[PDB]
């Protein structure tokens, strides 16, 4: 064994960095001898630099084993002191033997083996320190989980002040321990998970204190809301403990998070199940009354459930999945069959009644098929995570602690999570492997447990079975994680811009055989089609579903066509000009449909919250005390879910990049969980008015909710770009005013307030849209124009409240209609002034000037430069997705010109190097010097990109894209230095000296995932750099040349 060279911290970044530089000298001069110049000079000098850093490190560790009391430190530090102090001598011995004879051939095996021991050994030593460092935090977090468990056990005010007095100092120490950690990590995304997870611990601290204030007031003076009180603390203590466990999950990370996928897709099931339950009332309603009309708020509701369940299914399973989408088409055709015969014939016959009842029977059964899938997918995560937590502590039992009292809870405790994964995982076949591997372990554990109570243990039979278990425990553990992974992961699709490129790769180029899903991007677009169609009406449905159907037709024109081998030929050239321009017009209609969808939905933002306050805030009931409030709270949920839903919609359909889409998501997730807690708070705190908590704690939960909804509208506009947004809101205010202008004499009571309600929150919301762009950009001139038309908006909004509110009790015409329509077009003009603000105020559009070059009667330089790269140069052995990443970078880079833009140059070079490197991973067997220099060129080449990426950002004047550029390129230096070290590790490897086939294949997969992160990260930096060069202000430091490439140049 050898599990991993880890580069995850800053302390560990600067020690492994220089160490690979040391062995680098030793590695190139090694191969040099074999080919022609057998010349291995005084190796004492370079070996003195190595010993320098290695000695400083073993001194700290030897002192640690005599002072820390942790035994895992005791069983893992010696091994770290082992290959390090042994391998350092091995190479030191070649310094002395090659001194006499520089040709010692057996010493060449001594040189490559000791060099692998510098990396193996130094790594292992730095992880043993870091693992204990984390354990300090893990023990403290475990301490938090235990104290929350005793939360509901506390009953009195006196005991609450004591509880706050112990959980307060404890939360403040976990605060500081988390702060030390992120400041030290290397992976920018792990810092984002830690900060976000703690931020939720912080928003949950109010909620905890306010839930214990309700429990005391409810135990001394008990009111109808005793049940709900237990429920408010329960939503806090569960969410709090779920965040603590997540934090502990992040803290033990080396590569990236596979488990992240699991709990995120589990979260997708959650918000899909809530959307479905919100419209199951409209679903049954339509099926009940034989002919309670069509396609209106009825048919649309049932078809919406089948689309939302359709999403669940595609991220569900394999055979189980074929039943979810299988039951969607069976209930899909059946629900529309009742929409054909009952809408046309309109005849409620014995069949139409028994068929519509077989549709609802299935709709609820399909609710149970998605629910059981959500129970499992979540239960598969929870069972896996609790194992990883107990594996390291339970391992301190199998390795000879002759006297394991409660260590019995580790195996058996872990064994429990084993059979859970058996039943929870379908596909009865690997379920059987889980149970047979469980029962053979179960017998082996019974052998030792019997021997423990009788004595023995320190004997040849007791030890052979003690080691036989530990080895078959990791085989049961890998089979357990092969239960969650082998079975049901369909991978990556988050945002549109990436999905467009993901599908553009497999389509425009038969570069097939990497089973991720660009073909599920196609599937992703079909999904974004169905949902956007069912929440809208007639004409739109025809044009939108035209695109969707044509996308499947032209895309399938590849599945069966060029899969056998046709096309770059006229067939592929035909789908490439139509599929490429179809998705262009598909996303265009999707975003134009969303833009209008987000204008009409988020208008109000704030209607429910107030309507809940006049109820319990407003006692002295004349109508039905409850009934009125209870149906008003039903209007708060129904509309809150409508905002929630509308929100991820825009999340998965706009320009939100990799970080904004995941934001909106978690925004809606906390929001949907808090939506019931808002209504639940009103119950207890508005049944009995007058209490102190009645308006205190009710206002506290209200605020915590608006805190998520304020941030909602924020993340939402960072995706559907202002310019377009304003159009949909513009035309929609105009048509909502004209509806009030015609309603002007006839029906007026509240048809005028409704018209005064729209312009109210509509124009006030455009004032928010503007105030954001202003604080989101410098640009002195632009900042003025926008604030200029913003001042003409407010000066119009006020007078429109007065003019139209006096028309309530309507007077003549020369006073009502002419006064509010003179101020009415004052709105359409102040708003049109805001529009001119966003459209380039620099020289207008009269520049058509043709050059009519007439001559009769009787040049350009750039021409020379740009490279290309091979396909099928040398690779028929194993995995070359490294070349697939190299082609992803070049295909984007070549789009632009090279001169006057070293960023573009450096990037093209970075793909060429990555190509060479993809050929040196299988062959080589002597090409070690070349692999070393290859990663030194990409490292220096990435230093160029990062230098100029930092500069471009400094000159751009649009905070959003500025911080998004800096961030996406800020992880380039760390990712490139990680490629230098991981390249020197493979340098010494790919040999014949005790070639561990798993260690050479493991170093390959880390040099591959580390090369994927890099080529994908520079690709992104180029696009974000080009966008940043659009807004460069009058005094701009500098501007690079950005021009596209055709036969022009």
- Which among 203, 221, 255 is the end of a domain? 255
The answer to the question of residue 869 being in a domain is: no
Residue 9 phi/psi, 5° resolution? -125, 170
- Ranges of beta strands (E only) in 37-84 are none
Burial 488-523 (b: 16+ CB within 10 A, else e): bebeebbbbebbbbbbbbbbbeebeeeeebbbbbbb
Q: Write the secondary structure of 234-254 as one string of H (helix), E (strand) and C (coil).
A: HHHHHHHHHHHHHHHHHCCCC
Q: Are residues 587 and 653 in the same domain?
A: yes
Query: Distance between CA 324 and CA 318 in Å, rounded?
Result: 10
Q: Collapsing DSSP states into helix, strand and coil, what is residue 896?
A: strand
Six token digits for residue 464: 């052979």
Could you tell me the CA-to-CA distances from 547 to 498, 533, 535, 578 in Å, in that order?
20, 12, 17, 12
Residue 1032 phi/psi, 5° resolution? -110, 120
User: How far is Cα of residue 273 from the mean position of the Cα atoms in its chain?
Assistant: 20
Q: How many domains does the chain have?
A: 5
Query: Distance between CA 77 and CA 73 in Å, rounded?
Result: 6
Neighbours of 800 (CB within 10 A): 19
- Which among 444, 462, 491 is the end of a domain? 491
Query: Distance between CA 400 and CA 458 in Å, rounded?
Result: 8
The answer to the question of residue 850 being in a domain is: no
Q: Are residues 426 and 526 in the same domain?
A: no
- Of 573, 552, 571, the C-alpha closest to 562 is 571
Residues 6+ apart with CB under 8 A from 690: none
Per the CB < 8 A criterion, the answer to whether 491 and 517 are in contact is yes
Q: Are residues 575 and 609 in the same domain?
A: yes
Q: What CATH number has the domain bearing residue 821? A: 1.20.120.230
Q: Are residues 137 and 150 in the same domain?
A: yes
- Ranges of beta strands (E only) in 100-176 are none
User: Which one-letter DSSP state was computed for residue 779?
Assistant: -
Query: Distance between CA 691 and CA 16 in Å, rounded?
Result: 63
Query: Distance between CA 573 and CA 578 in Å, rounded?
Result: 9
The answer to the question of residue 849 being in a domain is: no
The angle at the Cα of 329, spanning 328 to 333, to the nearest 5 degrees, equals 120
Per the CB < 8 A criterion, the answer to whether 677 and 701 are in contact is yes
Q: What CATH number has the domain bearing residue 318? A: 1.20.120.810
- Of 747, 865, 741, 759, the C-alpha closest to 802 is 759
Query: Distance between CA 123 and CA 116 in Å, rounded?
Result: 11
DSSP H helices, 685-811, are: 692-717, 722-742, 755-775, 780-805
The answer to the question of residue 138 being in a domain is: yes
Six token digits for residue 741: 């202008």
Q: Are residues 329 and 248 in the same domain?
A: no
Q: Collapsing DSSP states into helix, strand and coil, what is residue 660?
A: helix
Where do we find the tokens 């086939």? 997
Six token digits for residue 497: 């811009």
Element containing residue 866 per DSSP (H, E): none
User: How far is Cα of residue 861 from the mean position of the Cα atoms in its chain?
Assistant: 46
Q: Collapsing DSSP states into helix, strand and coil, what is residue 312?
A: helix
Where do we find the tokens 């080449």? 941
What's the length of the chain? 1049
HSE on the CB side for 464, CA within 13 Å?
3
The angle at the Cα of 524, spanning 669 to 647, to the nearest 5 degrees, equals 30
Six token digits for residue 1044: 């596209």
Burial 61-86 (b: 16+ CB within 10 A, else e): beebeeebebebbeebbeebbebbee
Solved with: X-ray
Six token digits for residue 326: 């299988």
Could you tell me the CA-to-CA distances from 178 to 136, 332, 577 in Å, in that order?
11, 50, 52
Query: Distance between CA 238 and CA 684 in Å, rounded?
Result: 20
Per the CB < 8 A criterion, the answer to whether 655 and 715 are in contact is no
- Of 674, 609, 675, 640, the C-alpha closest to 207 is 674
- Of 251, 26, 1, 12, the C-alpha closest to 122 is 12
Per the CB < 8 A criterion, the answer to whether 22 and 984 are in contact is no
Query: Distance between CA 769 and CA 764 in Å, rounded?
Result: 9
Q: Collapsing DSSP states into helix, strand and coil, what is residue 276?
A: helix
HSE on the CB side for 186, CA within 13 Å?
20
HSE on the CB side for 843, CA within 13 Å?
3
- Of 710, 665, 712, the C-alpha closest to 270 is 665
Could you tell me the CA-to-CA distances from 829 to 777, 835, 836, 912 in Å, in that order?
24, 10, 11, 55
The answer to the question of residue 436 being in a domain is: yes
Q: Collapsing DSSP states into helix, strand and coil, what is residue 666?
A: helix
DSSP H helices, 748-779, are: 755-775
Q: Are residues 687 and 784 in the same domain?
A: no
The answer to the question of residue 996 being in a domain is: yes
- Of 204, 189, 327, the C-alpha closest to 260 is 189
Six token digits for residue 864: 């020379």
Neighbours of 323 (CB within 10 A): 16
Helix, strand counts (H, E) of the chain: 35, 0
- The string of DSSP letters for 597-648 reads HHHHHSS-SSHHHHHHHHHHHS-S-SS-HHHHHHHHSHHHHHHHHHHHHHHH
Q: Are residues 577 and 555 in the same domain?
A: yes
- The string of DSSP letters for 551-581 reads HHHHHHHHHSSTTSS--SSHHHHHHHHHHHH
Query: Distance between CA 463 and CA 469 in Å, rounded?
Result: 10
Per the CB < 8 A criterion, the answer to whether 548 and 529 are in contact is yes
The answer to the question of residue 1008 being in a domain is: yes
Cα torsion at 911, 915, 916, 921 (round to 10°)? 130
Resolution in A: 3.1
Where do we find the tokens 């091995």? 90
Query: Distance between CA 321 and CA 310 in Å, rounded?
Result: 9
Q: Collapsing DSSP states into helix, strand and coil, what is residue 294?
A: coil
Q: Are residues 271 and 200 in the same domain?
A: no
Per the CB < 8 A criterion, the answer to whether 373 and 316 are in contact is yes
Largest CA distance in the chain: 117
Burial 917-943 (b: 16+ CB within 10 A, else e): bbbbbbeeeebbbbbbebbbebbebbe
Q: Collapsing DSSP states into helix, strand and coil, what is residue 537?
A: coil
- Of 668, 744, 681, the C-alpha closest to 708 is 668
Q: Are residues 423 and 282 in the same domain?
A: yes
Query: Distance between CA 469 and CA 415 in Å, rounded?
Result: 12
**R_g over Cα of the chain:** 34
Burial class from Cβ neighbours inside 10 Å (0-12, 13-18, 19+) for residue 708 reads buried
Query: For the chain, first and last CA: distance in Å?
Result: 55
Q: Are residues 231 and 304 in the same domain?
A: no
Per the CB < 8 A criterion, the answer to whether 677 and 235 are in contact is yes
- Which among 720, 747, 766 is the end of a domain? 720
Residues 6+ apart with CB under 8 A from 761: 603, 604, 605, 606
Where do we find the tokens 């069509």? 294
The answer to the question of residue 585 being in a domain is: yes
Q: Are residues 590 and 507 in the same domain?
A: yes
Residue 518 domain boundaries: 492-720
- Of 2, 4, 247, 1, the C-alpha closest to 1006 is 4
Q: Are residues 84 and 211 in the same domain?
A: yes
């Amino acid at each position: 064994v050898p599990r991993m060279p880890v580069f995850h911290t800053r302390t560990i970044e600067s020690i492994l960095e220089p160490v690979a530089q040391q062995i680098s000298h030793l590695v190139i001069m090694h191969e040099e001898g074999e080919v022609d110049g057998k010349a291995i000079p005084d190796l004492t000098a370079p070996v003195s630099a190595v010993q320098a850093a290695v000695s400083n490190l073993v001194r700290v560790g030897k002192e640690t084993v005599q002072t820390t009391e942790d035994q895992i430190l005791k069983r893992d530090m010696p091994p770290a002191f082992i290959k390090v102090e042994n391998a350092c001598t091995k190479l030191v011995r070649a310094a002395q033997m090659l001194q006499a004879d520089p040709y010692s051939v057996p010493a060449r095996d001594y040189l490559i083996d000791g060099s692998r021991g510098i990396l193996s050994g130094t790594s292992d030593l730095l992880l043993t320190f870091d693992e204990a460092e984390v354990r300090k935090i893990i023990r403290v977090c475990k301490g938090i989980l235990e104290y929350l468990t005793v939360a509901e056990v506390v009953e009195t005010m006196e005991d609450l002040v004591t509880y706050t007095k112990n959980l307060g100092p404890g939360m403040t120490k976990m605060a500081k321990m988390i702060d030390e950690r992120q400041q030290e990590l290397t992976h920018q995304e792990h810092r984002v998970m830690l900060v976000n997870s703690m931020n939720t611990v912080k928003e949950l601290l109010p909620v905890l204190i306010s839930a214990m204030k309700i429990f005391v007031t409810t135990k001394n003076t008990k009111s109808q809301g005793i049940e709900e009180a237990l429920k408010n603390r329960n939503f806090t203590v569960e969410k709090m403990s779920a965040e603590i466990n997540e934090i502990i999950r992040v803290l033990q990370l080396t590569s990236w998070d596979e488990d992240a996928w699991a709990s995120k897709d589990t979260e997708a099931m959650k918000r899909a199940l809530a959307l479905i339950d919100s419209k199951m009332n409209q679903a049954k309603g339509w099926l009940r009354d034989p002919n309670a009309p069509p396609g209106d708020a009825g048919e649309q509701a049932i078809r919406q459930i089948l689309d939302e369940a359709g999403k669940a299914g595609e991220l569900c399973a394999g055979k189980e999945r074929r039943e979810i989408l299988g039951t969607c088409k069976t209930l899909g055709q059946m629900t529309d069959q009742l929409a054909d015969l009952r809408a046309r014939g309109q005849g409620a016959t014995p069949m139409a009644m028994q068929k519509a009842q077989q549709v609802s029977q299935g709709l609820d059964l399909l609710t149970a098929k998605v629910e059981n899938a959500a129970r499992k997918l979540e239960a598969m995560t929870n069972s896996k995570q609790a194992i990883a937590k107990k594996i390291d502590a339970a391992q301190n039992w199998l390795a000879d602690p002759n006297g394991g009292s409660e260590g019995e809870e580790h195996i058996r405790g872990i064994m429990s999570e084993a059979r859970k994964v058996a039943e929870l995982c379908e596909e009865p076949k690997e379920r059987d492997d889980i149970l047979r591997s469980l029962g053979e372990i179960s017998a082996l554990t019974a052998k030792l447990s019997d021997l423990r109570r009788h004595g023995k243990g320190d004997s040849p039979e007791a030890r052979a079975l003690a080691k036989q278990i530990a080895t078959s425990l990791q085989n049961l553990q890998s089979k357990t994680n092969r239960a969650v992974a082998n079975t049901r992961p369909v991978k990556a699709a988050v945002h549109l811009e990436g999905k467009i490129e993901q599908a553009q790769r497999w389509i425009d180029n038969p570069t097939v055989d990497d089973r991720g899903v660009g073909q599920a991007a196609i599937r992703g677009l079909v999904a974004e089609g169905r949902r956007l169609a069912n929440v809208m009406m007639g004409p739109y449905r025809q044009d939108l579903l035209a695109k969707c159907d044509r996308v499947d037709q032209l895309a399938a024109q590849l599945a069966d066509l060029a899969a056998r081998g046709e096309g770059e030929s006229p067939q592929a050239r035909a789908i490439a000009a139509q599929l490429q321009d179809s998705l262009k017009d598909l996303k265009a209609r999707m975003q134009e449909a969303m833009t209008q969808e987000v204008s009409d939905v988020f208008s109000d933002t704030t209607t429910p919250i107030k309507l809940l306050a006049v109820a319990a805030t407003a006692p002295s009931d004349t109508p039905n005390r409850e009934e009125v409030f209870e149906e008003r709270a039903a209007n708060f949920e129904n509309h809150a879910a409508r905002l929630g839903a509308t929100a991820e919609k825009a999340a998965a359909v706009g320009t939100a990049n990799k970080t904004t889409v995941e934001g909106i998501q978690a925004t809606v997730k906390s929001a949907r969980e808090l939506t019931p807690q808002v209504v639940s708070a009103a119950r207890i705190l508005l049944r009995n008015p007058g209490n102190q908590a009645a308006y205190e704690h009710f206002e506290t939960m209200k605020n915590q909710w608006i805190d998520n909804v304020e941030k909602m509208t924020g993340l939402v506009d960072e995706a559907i770009d202002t310019k377009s947004l304003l159009d949909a809101s513009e035309e929609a205010i105009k048509k909502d005013l004209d509806k009030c202008k015609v309603a002007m004499a006839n029906m007026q009571p509240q048809m005028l307030v409704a018209g005064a309600t729209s312009i109210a929150r509509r124009a006030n919301r455009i004032l928010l849209v503007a105030k954001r762009e202003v604080e989101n950009s410098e640009d002195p001139k632009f900042r003025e124009a926008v604030k200029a038309a913003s001042d003409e908006l407010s000066k119009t909004i006020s007078p429109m409240v007065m003019d139209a509110k006096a028309v309530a009790g309507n007077i003549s015409d020369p006073g009502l209609q002419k006064s509010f329509l003179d101020s009415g077009y004052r709105i359409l003009g102040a708003v049109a002034k805001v529009r001119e603000a966003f459209q380039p105020q620099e020289p207008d559009f009269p520049p058509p000037p043709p050059d009519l070059e007439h001559l009769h009667l009787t040049p350009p330089p750039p021409e020379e430069k740009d490279e290309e790269f091979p396909e099928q140069k040398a690779g028929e052995a194993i995995n070359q997705p490294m070349m697939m990443a190299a082609r992803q970078l070049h295909d984007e880079a070549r789009k632009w010109s090279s001169k006057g833009n070293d960023i573009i140059a450096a990037a093209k070079r970075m793909a060429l190097l990555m190509a060479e490197m993809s050929r040196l991973v299988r062959g080589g067997s002597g090409n070690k010097r070349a692999l070393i220099q290859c990663a030194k060129d990409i490292a220096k080449a990435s230093d160029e990109v990062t230098r100029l990426a930092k500069e471009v950002a400094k000159q751009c004047t649009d905070k959003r894209i500025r911080t998004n550029l800096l961030q996406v390129c800020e992880r380039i230096p760390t990712i490139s230095t990680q490629l230098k070290i991981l390249s020197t590790v493979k340098a010494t490897m790919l040999g014949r000296t005790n070639i561990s086939d798993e260690e050479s294949e493991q170093a390959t997969e880390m040099l591959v995932h580390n090369a994927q992160n890099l080529m994908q990260s520079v690709k992104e930096t180029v696009r974000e750099a080009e966008a940043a060069s659009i807004k460069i202000r009058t005094d701009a430091g500098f501007t690079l040349r950005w021009v596209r490439k055709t036969p022009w140049y």
